[PDB]
């Protein structure tokens, strides 16, 4: 590289911040988005103890911290912590001053306006970027698949949203946003582990339960048969070693944790599972583009990485859909970073180069410029 100017494709997310320069294949730095103040007193003098460890540093000292995510469900609830996370991301994980780089944030659909306006105001006043643009997290995941149609189910860690798109024309009346995501699955797993004796309570042990969920849980092809099998044999019980020994054995908690996605009544949510909100999102579309959406169903986001979900979802939709249509579920192996790869592709386009919100435009219309033509 050299002259010229590259764009910063940041992607706030909720659970893992993924960032990197535009035009690559994978994000340069991926690290949890947690800011944890120490909670004990501290007796050693001169140890160089900081007041807040952010990012991946607080996943190693988590034994004496109180980690707290600054993004609850897509929306940002603690602006100071989010500013700290952004500052860390720019200066220590990429080491590029923001004064010389455009930024491309990402935002979930149907989010509060004030969140987006505050985001752009921060990026323009504190970090003082040249130009920033905010994009919907599902259109990027559709970019990365190299398609131009299809209905994308982006089940992140904060919020699961399902944006249908045809021929490049998004259908704003058919977006079905559901707030069940990876975090609720972690909490439900932590709640059902107590049925064997293992109690995880501290906010640090939520990370251990998350690791258990990632490494062991899988989505059952048929729920009742698995419940019957796990209750008779013992071929499912997989063991796992805690960060201090005392291995634990997970029985039928393995496929009961991610089953909450298809039956949100487990955690008390009323709505229908991710297998039926996709069909409802399709049926709201026009009668002539339903075949294409059926054939190009796209999966993205981290939580769709459970082993065996691309078959359960296809079976469910085939049960719901008319018998003639072909149901195909696109599940690329690079699912987790699909949104960021799409963001890199979009930022690398020449046609897109004039859509950025230039700073002089913000100076003339204020932060409310984001809702205007420069979307």
């Amino acid at each position: 590289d050299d002259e010229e100017t590259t764009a910063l494709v940041c992607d706030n997310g909720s659970g893992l911040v993924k960032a990197g320069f535009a035009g690559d294949d994978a994000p340069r730095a991926v690290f949890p988005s947690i800011v944890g103040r120490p909670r004990h007193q501290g007796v050693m003098v001169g140890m160089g103890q900081k007041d807040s460890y952010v990012g991946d540093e607080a996943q190693s000292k988590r034994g004496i911290l109180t980690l707290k995510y600054p993004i609850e469900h897509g929306i940002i609830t603690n602006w100071d912590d989010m500013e700290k996370i952004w500052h860390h991301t720019f200066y220590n994980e990429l080491r590029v001053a923001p004064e010389e780089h455009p930024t491309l944030l990402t935002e979930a659909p149907l989010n509060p306006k004030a969140n987006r306006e505050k985001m752009t105001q921060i990026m323009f006043e504190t970090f003082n970027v040249p130009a920033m643009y905010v994009a919907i997290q599902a259109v990027l995941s559709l970019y990365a698949s190299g398609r131009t149609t299809g209905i994308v189910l982006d089940s992140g860690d904060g919020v699961t949203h399902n944006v249908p798109i045809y021929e490049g024309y998004a259908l704003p009346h058919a977006i079905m946003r559901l707030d069940l995501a990876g975090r609720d699955l972690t909490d439900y797993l932590m709640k059902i582990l107590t049925e064997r004796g293992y109690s995880f309570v501290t906010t640090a042990e939520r990370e251990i339960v998350r690791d258990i969920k990632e490494k062991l849980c899988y989505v059952a092809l048929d729920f009742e048969n698995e419940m019957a099998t796990a209750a008779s044999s013992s071929s499912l019980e997989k063991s796992y070693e805690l960060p201090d020994g005392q291995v634990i054995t997970i029985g039928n908690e393995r496929f009961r944790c991610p089953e909450t996605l298809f039956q949100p009544s487990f955690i008390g949510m009323e709505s229908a599972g991710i297998h039926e909100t996709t069909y409802n999102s399709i049926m709201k579309c026009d009668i002539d583009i339903r075949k294409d959406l059926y054939a190009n169903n796209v999966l993205s986001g981290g939580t769709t990485m459970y082993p065996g979900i691309a078959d359960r979802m296809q079976k469910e939709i085939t049960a719901l859909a008319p018998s003639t249509m072909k149901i195909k579920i696109i599940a690329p192996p690079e699912r987790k970073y699909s949104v960021w790869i799409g963001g890199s592709i979009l930022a690398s386009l020449s046609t897109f180069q004039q859509m950025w919100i230039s700073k002089q435009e913000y100076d003339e219309a204020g932060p409310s410029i984001v809702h205007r033509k420069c979307f």
């Binding site: 490494k215 082993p307 065996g308 691309a310």
Partner: protein, 82 residues
Amino acid sequence: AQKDEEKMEIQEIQLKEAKHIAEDADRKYEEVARKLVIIESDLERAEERAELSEGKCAELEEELKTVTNNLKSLEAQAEKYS
């Protein structure tokens, strides 16, 4: 007086022998302590190498599991397609 002279002589003899034994013991202690530090560093290096190898092994296990599941699913789909 003669008793005292004999006692002084034997005391001096045993004193010198004990001092030489003490010198030998101190020298042996120093040498073995240095060798122990060396072996301890070697043990630390062996431990870290084993840890890295086990981590890579676990990652490879996960990858093979995922890809084999994909193969099984695709084979079932191919049979249904025929």
